[PDB]
From a paper:
Right, zoom-in views of binding interface, showing 17-residue HC CDR3 wedging into a groove formed by two segments of residues 339-346 and residues 440-445. The Asn343 glycan of RBD also interacted with Tyr99 from HC CDR3. Two glycans at Asn122 and Asn165 in the NTD were in proximity to CDR2 (Asn53, Ser54, Gly56, Thr57 and Asn58) and HC FW3 (Thr73, Ser74 and Ile75). We noted that these two glycosylation sites were highly conserved among different VOCs. Indeed, a surface plasmon resonance competition assay showed that SP-77 did not compete with ACE2 for binding to the RBD or spike trimer.
Author numbering:
A (entry chain L): 1 to 94, 96 to 213
B (entry chain H): 1 to 52, 52A, 53 to 82, 82A, 82B, 82C, 83 to 100, 100A, ...
C (entry chain C): 341 to 583
D (entry chain A): 14 to 69, 77 to 244, 254 to 340
């Protein structure tokens, strides 16, 4: 087998800046390497073939270079249509793929618009209690959340989902759900979820209680 | 102009088999190889094998040898993958893509045109329609300037549950979050909208949740308390 | 034809039909990219002034030492066992070095010739047979034996091979001229047609001088020209309007 | 599917005279009011052509040689001859050409075919709707490496009719030269009970296929619980082309209306040497004769040791 590893897993880049991504082989490929772009919600597209030839109709900003075991791909000035994951694939022995590099638009820091919702009378009637924590419109992705019951953290019963980078103005939103039995929600007087994020000088707390 | 068209999404039990087709059009089918390739949810690309439509000969990535079979009918210009004994982890998006007609080398694979792709979903569970609940802000007296409210869309299995607000007219401040797999193995998601606090006591908010696999199309109104 | 990613093998050489189209042989012949461009019944300069009945491109790869065998009347394992041009061939042989297209540092082996055959093959035939070749006086059965051989051999195209052991792509264009209704032409624009006056005419590349009259002759669909007892043209069917 | 048909009578092989048939237009040039001399692969005049038939009882589709090319003709009703197979081995060790006129399309195809032992097509006969329908295409069990394909634009062919005489004569000349398989063809109306008719017509060129294959043999395709069947009546005739001079009479309309086979007899050689279809009283010089060699004799010294060129 021949392994392909891409060094940057993700990059934050502003409009007009230069972007570089590296594909590293386990073995000397000479130049038997190709590069692809995948946009969110679509199939991949071939950008550079033979490690340094640009494909037909591709914007002149896209570039590739090097020979042997190690290769670069480059965008000379990134623009908003370029956003997606970029992948190498080789051809010295089978079309083995690399791990891929994500690109996001670089933006100033922004703290979340930040909320919580207790379990509904409609859902509690099904025998299950889900309480959800919402963070909306922040930028540095790594928005850390934690759950509290009687000022203690729990395990194995919360989940989270994160909405894709907003095409309108470069923002992130995620929600965390804590799911419990109806009886576990009856047992605990006090609930919260709490946020650590780079837009906050101290971690934000936002508790509620059953009947409050 | 050239096109590759896949079949609609596939849903199957563990240990079962799935057959997926690419109909080619706009070019001569026997000129170049067809590859099959996949992508697991939020992950990197993963090659299966290729077939040479002029010859029917085929070569695989090792891991899939003796699991996948590739085939093709030249009259109907259709390439197929038939995949045996589906693992739960064979839940992925799948594609086929063409072997570069001009300007390459004699060897090199590339992937010069790709079809729109298809989803294969693997689970032990049967088809189940969603339940939808109010993510409604606690105490009307505790919204200050902007409010958030929503639709928790819960325990439904045939993937692609679509959501829209106020018969699909409302879009400002709306978000819909990627569906996540539970410990039960079924899907769930949220959608939420941000609104003025002043309009919450007078306007109506509602979501339509559509799940074609269970023929289920459920409306509800979101209300303060 | 000329820029396709992968060519056919010389043992199993491809043939494409070229029809109902405008050729521009200047775009081909004025290119610097061709190491051989030899024609056999026409000059490459004149290809733009002609129209052609049927045209076929034959596409394959060989070793740079072997491009000499693609000329008509030559002999050796390529001209004897997998690709022969006829002695009265009309057409052009076009060839170039492929040491960045068909050649690999581990060796490329996708290209094969035919090493053995009970007989030399006839002009423009192709043999696909994978039958075992009995070089000895004994017969043999099954896949192999002593002095029984597989009839094909693979070229080892490596970029470390010297010139002559490097791959060469070959295209042979194999048309016929001025004898039948035409379907592929050079880029020449037609004039109007004039009658009862002395003119320098040119019909599908049949140039001459004379007066044109509406004839009462009844040509069949396969006939483009009529000839005199002196074997000169004395009637023609206008390729724009079929009178 | 392939089947070995068994329900047929044994007859000895029939033959008939090909009077002046199997001439074709030798090139794509108009000529008129002229006697033109041409040397080509032609069916000789008055040559003894092999005769094959479907009757009631009889239905013969043998593998036949294709040496130097074939004149084929069917004297016919009800569309019974539907095409041919050409090649050498006929069994996917080598390539072969298939031409079929199925009920809706001509299909011309070249691939390593595995043909049946006796290939045929089949029709369900007069079944309830007062109609006839093609339902069997027992021609090949596989078609492997395939390098030429053509299918005609679709038509409807009638699979019905019964008469005490044949109505159509369809004549074909097949040549395989410099990698090209050439077809010349003619249809002429007829009204005859049996035997290839006396007469003349010239075959026009039909098509010229760039197939690139060796051909030493051919077989025809006929249209008919997997034995016991009715053969619809149809006759076909096979003769072999060989290289010889013909003198062709183009009439004032530019059709070949007559020919002289210049090798048939001393009067036909006299007609060609005078370039005329009529000859006056006289004695005329014709080609000088010559006894040809019976075998080849090679005489070299009985030296056997190889020459020292390594040194
Ligand atoms: C086209 O196909 C033909 C049929 O396969 C093939 O003819 C065969 O050619 C070989 C070589 O000439 C002959 O082999 C025999 O040659 C002599 C007898 O003629 C013997 O001394 C040898 O030991 C050997 O057995 C075959 O007999 C001959 N078969 C026939 C039916 O004629 C042609 O060579 C092929 N031509 C091309 C251009 O591919
Ligand atoms: C005679 O042999 C023919 C060649 O194999 C065969 O042709 C095939 O006929 C079918 C039916 O018409 C075609 O099917 C297609 O028809 C139209 C084409 O526009 C489409 O709308 C359909 O979806 C379908 O794709 C085949 O494409 C055609 N094959 C080829 C290679 O042309 C005839 O059917 C044979 N006839 C009999 C009576 O057996
Ligand atoms: C004519 O048709 C033949 C059968 O379809 C075809 O033969 C096949 O050729 C491929 C290679 O091109 C073989 O594939 C295998 O080759 C070796 C076998 O040791 C393995 O290393 C490979 O991984 C691969 O599995 C087929 O096995 C072979 N089939 C047979 C029955 O021999 C010819 O290639 C066709 N000819 C042309 C001109 O295309
Ligand atoms: C060359 O082709 C000519 C066109 O087909 C053909 O001319 C046609 O000949 C026939 C027989 O002489 C004429 O038939 C008619 O004759 C008179 C009228 O002139 C009528 O009384 C008859 O009933 C009958 O209809 C055609 O009129 C005539 N056509 C033309 C346009 O003049 C020649 O005969 C052909 N020549 C050869 C050598 O075959
Ligand atoms: C001249 O020599 C060639 C090849 O060079 C020799 O190869 C070995 C056989 C060995 O002698 C080395 O020291 C030399 O460098 C001869 O070619 C061989 O010929 C035989 C048949 O006689 C054949 O079976 C081999 O496959 C050939 N080998 C190679 C490598 O080509 C050649 O025969 C000699 N020339 C003359 C006129 O005798
Ligand atoms: C039809 O008959 C032919 C021969 O009459 C059969 O062909 C034989 O097939 C066997 C293998 O089954 C071979 O060993 C022989 O060499 C073949 N002989 C010939 C003359 O080809 C054919 O198998 C029969 N098919 C059916 C369906 O009965
Ligand atoms: C035609 O050929 C056969 C031999 O194939 C011969 O017996 C027969 O007599 C010939 N026919 C005539 C009418 O002479
Ligand atoms: C009659 O023709 C139809 C097709 O039109 C066919 O399906 C049916 O089998 C035929 N019936 C008989 C008895 O032949």
């Amino acid at each position: 087998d021949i392994q392909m590893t891409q060094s940057p897993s993700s990059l934050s880049a502003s409009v007009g800046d230069r972007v570089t991504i590296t594909c590293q082989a386990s073995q000397d490929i000479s130049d038997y390497l190709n590069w692809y772009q995948q946009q969110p919600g679509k199939a991949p597209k071939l950008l550079i073939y033979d490690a340094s030839n640009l494909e037909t109709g591709v914007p002149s900003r896209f570039s590739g270079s090097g020979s042997g075991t190690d290769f670069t791909f480059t965008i000379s000035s990134l623009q908003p249509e370029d956003i997606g994951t970029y992948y190498c694939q080789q051809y010295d022995n089978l079309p083995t793929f690399g791990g891929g590099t994500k690109l996001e638009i670089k933006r100033t820091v922004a703290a979340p618009s930040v909320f919580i919702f207790p379990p509904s009378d409609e859902q509690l009637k099904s025998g299950t209690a889900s309480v959800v924590c919402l963070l909306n419109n922040f930028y540095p992705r790594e928005a850390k959340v934690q759950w509290k019951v009687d000022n203690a953290l729990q395990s194995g019963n919360s989940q989270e989902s994160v909405t894709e980078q907003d095409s309108k103005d470069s923002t992130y939103s995620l929600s965390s759900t804590l799911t419990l039995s109806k009886a576990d929600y009856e047992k605990h007087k006090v609930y919260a979820c709490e946020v650590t994020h780079q837009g906050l000088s101290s971690p934000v707390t936002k508790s509620f209680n059953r009947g409050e | 102009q050239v096109q590759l068209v896949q079949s609609g999404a596939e849903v199957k039990k563990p240990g079962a088999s799935v057959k997926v087709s690419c109909k080619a059009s706009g070019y001569t089918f026997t000129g170049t190889y067809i590859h099959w390739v996949r992508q697991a949810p939020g992950q990197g690309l993963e090659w299966m094998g290729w077939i040479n439509p002029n010859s029917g000969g085929t070569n695989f990535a090792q891991i899939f040898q003796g699991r996948v079979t590739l085939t093709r009918d030249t009259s109907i210009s259709t390439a197929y993958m038939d995949l045996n004994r589906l693992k739960s982890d064979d839940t992925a998006v799948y594609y086929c893509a063409r072997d570069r007609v001009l300007y390459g080398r004699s060897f090199g694979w590339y992937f010069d045109v790709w079809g729109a792709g298809t989803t294969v979903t693997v689970s032990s569970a049967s088809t189940k329609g969603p339940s939808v609940f109010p993510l409604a802000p606690c105490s009307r007296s505790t919204s200050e300037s902007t409010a958030a409210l929503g639709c928790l869309v819960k325990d439904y299995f045939p993937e692609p549950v679509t959501v829209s607000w106020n018969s699909g007219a409302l879009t400002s401040g709306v978000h819909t979050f990627p569906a996540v797999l539970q410990s039960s193995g079924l899907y769930s998601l949220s959608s939420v909208v941000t609104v003025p606090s002043s309009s919450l006591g007078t306007k109506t908010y509602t979501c339509n949740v559509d799940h074609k696999p269970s023929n289920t199309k459920v409306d509800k109104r979101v209300e303060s308390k | 034809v000329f820029n396709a990613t992968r060519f056919a093998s010389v043992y199993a050489w491809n043939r494409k039909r070229i029809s109902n189209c405008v050729a521009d042989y200047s775009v081909l012949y004025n290119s610097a990219s061709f190491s051989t461009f030899k024609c056999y019944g026409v000059s490459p300069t004149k290809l733009n002034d002609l129209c052609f009945t049927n045209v076929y491109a034959d596409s394959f790869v060989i070793r740079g030492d072997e491009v000499r065998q693609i000329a008509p009347g030559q002999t050796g394992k390529i001209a004897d066992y997998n690709y022969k041009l006829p002695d009265d061939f009309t057409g052009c042989v076009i060839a170039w070095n492929s040491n960045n297209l068909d050649s690999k540092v581990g060796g490329n082996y996708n290209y094969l010739y035919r090493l053995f055959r009970k007989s030399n093959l006839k002009p423009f035939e192709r043999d696909i047979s994978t039958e075992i070749y009995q070089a000895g006086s004994t017969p043999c059965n099954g896949v192999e034996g002593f002095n029984c051989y597989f009839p094909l051999q693979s070229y080892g195209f490596q970029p470390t091979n010297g010139v002559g052991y490097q791959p060469y792509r070959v295209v042979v264009l194999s048309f016929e001229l001025l004898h039948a209704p035409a379907t592929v032409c050079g880029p020449k624009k037609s004039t109007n047609l004039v009658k009862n006056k002395c003119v320098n005419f040119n019909f599908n590349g049949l140039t001459g001088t004379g007066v044109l009259t509406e004839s009462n002759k009844k040509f069949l669909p396969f006939q483009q020209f009529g000839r005199d007892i002196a074997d000169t043209t004395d009637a023609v069917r206008d390729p724009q309007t079929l009178e | 599917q392939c089947v070995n048909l068994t329900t047929r009578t044994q007859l000895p092989p029939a033959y008939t005279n090909s009077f002046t048939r199997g001439v074709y237009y030798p090139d794509k040039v108009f000529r008129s009011s002229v006697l033109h001399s041409t040397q080509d692969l032609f069916l000789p005049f008055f040559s003894n052509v092999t005769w094959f038939h479907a009757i009631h009882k009889r239905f013969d589709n043998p593998v036949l040689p294709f040496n130097d090319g074939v004149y084929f003709a069917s004297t016919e009703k009800s569309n019974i001859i539907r095409g041919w197979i050409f090649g050498t081995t006929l069994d996917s060790k080598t390539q072969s050409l298939l031409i079929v006129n199925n009920a809706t399309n001509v299909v011309i195809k070249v691939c390593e075919f595995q043909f049946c032992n006796d290939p045929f097509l089949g029709v369900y006969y007069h079944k309830n709707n007062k109609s006839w329908m093609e339902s069997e295409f027992r021609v090949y069990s596989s078609a492997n490496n395939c390098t030429f394909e053509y299918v005609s634009q679709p038509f409807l062919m009638d699979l019905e009719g019964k008469q005490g005489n044949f109505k159509n004569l369809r004549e074909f000349v097949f040549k395989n030269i410099d990698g090209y398989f050439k077809i010349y063809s003619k249809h002429t109306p007829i009204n005859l009970v049996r035997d290839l008719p006396q007469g003349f017509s010239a075959l026009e060129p039909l098509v010229d296929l760039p197939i690139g294959i060796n051909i030493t043999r051919f077989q025809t395709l006929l249209a008919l619980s997997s034995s016991g069947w009715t053969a619809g009546a149809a006759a076909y005739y096979v003769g072999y082309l060989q290289p010889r001079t013909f003198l062709l009479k183009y009439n004032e309309n530019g059709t070949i209306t007559d020919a002289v086979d210049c090798a048939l007899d001393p009067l036909s050689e006299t007609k060609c040497t005078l370039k005329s279809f009529t000859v006056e009283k006289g004695i005329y010089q014709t080609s000088n004769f010559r006894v040809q060699p019976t075998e080849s004799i090679v005489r070299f010294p009985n030296i056997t040791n190889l020459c020292p060129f390594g040194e």
